[PDB]
Amino acid sequence: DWVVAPISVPENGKGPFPQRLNQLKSNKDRDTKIFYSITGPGADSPPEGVFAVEKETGWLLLNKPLDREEIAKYELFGHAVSENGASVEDPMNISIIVTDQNDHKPKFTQDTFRGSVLEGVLPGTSVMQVTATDEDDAIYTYNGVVAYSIHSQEPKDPHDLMFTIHRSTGTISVISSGLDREKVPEYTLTIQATDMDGDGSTTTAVAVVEILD
Ligand SMILES: [Ca+2]
Ligand SMILES: [Ca+2]
Ligand SMILES: [Ca+2]
């Protein structure tokens, strides 16, 4: 049984590189000199040379920082060969799981979202629902969890802050009375989406609200 438990490595490691991860050891090295090697995507096939193993010592090395959103999991195989050329172990399955950091900003699905209401809708009326996605994890962390907010409203008649947005759903609602198509037939809202549920970084898009006739 030549085996190694799965290894989890956060993306965007600071190093220094190369970074030791685990030492591969065959116990057949008491009988002879052993040369270690690694194969698989990330080792000997694309992306090549992300991982390596030190020939004499069997230290598995990470050569550069990982990116979860490029490759989230690696399956490599370790090999142990004697000086006389015989493989002395069955190849070792080496599992490497890349864990998340918050390194993607949210992205709105559209640059412009449009919706419309009747002029006489009451306060609390839902206008439209906007959406932003985030490529980071949102299962175990907030890296991928978006909070929505309104950035600003034009024009500011009959007053400002006439709309709100649901922080989690992105539903934009009317919160004031005083819509009047004859005075202001359309509002341009700049809307924001922020990750870490409001504590992280932020992107913007526009929502245009038409007051119907
Ligand atoms: Ca990344
Ligand atoms: Ca990430
Ligand atoms: Ca993010």
Separation CA 168–CA 208 (nearest Å): 20
Q: Phi first, then psi: what are they for 30, rounded to 5°?
A: -80, -30
Indicate the burial class of 113 (C-beta count within 10 angstroms; 0-12, 13-18, 19 or more): buried
Distances 100 to 31, 67, 71, 188, 198 between C-alpha atoms, Å: 42, 9, 11, 36, 18
Instruction: Look at the chain and count its residues.
Output: 213
What is the 183 CA–ligand 2 centroid distance (Å)?
46
Burial of 147 (0-12, 13-18, 19+ CB in 10 A): buried
> Which experiment gave this structure?
X-ray
Question: With b meaning 16 or more CB within 10 Å and e meaning fewer, what string describes 169-206?
Answer: ebebbbeeeebeeeebeebebebbbbbbebebebbebb
Q: Give the residue from 16, 18, 51 showing the smallest Cα distance to 37.
A: 51
The token duo for 130 is 């906007």
Phi, psi angle pair for 28, to nearest 5°? -80, 0
- Nearest by Cα to 207 from 159, 148, 157, 158: 148
Cβ proximity of 198 and 165 under 8 Å: no
Asked whether 136 and 126 are in contact (CB, 8 A), the reply is: no
Find the 72 Cα to ligand 2 centroid distance in Å: 10
CA of 143 to the centre of ligand 2 (A): 7
Q: Which domains does the chain have, with CATH numbers?
A: 3-101 (2.60.40.60), 102-213 (2.60.40.60)
Q: Read off the amino acid at residue 6.
A: P
Distance 146 CA to ligand 1 centre (A): 17
Resolution (A): 1.6
Give 144 Cα–ligand 1 centroid separation in angstroms. 12
Distance 101 CA to ligand 3 centre (A): 8
| Closest ligand by atom to 142 CA | 3
In the 8-state DSSP scheme, what is residue 122? Answer: P
What type of residue is 78?
G
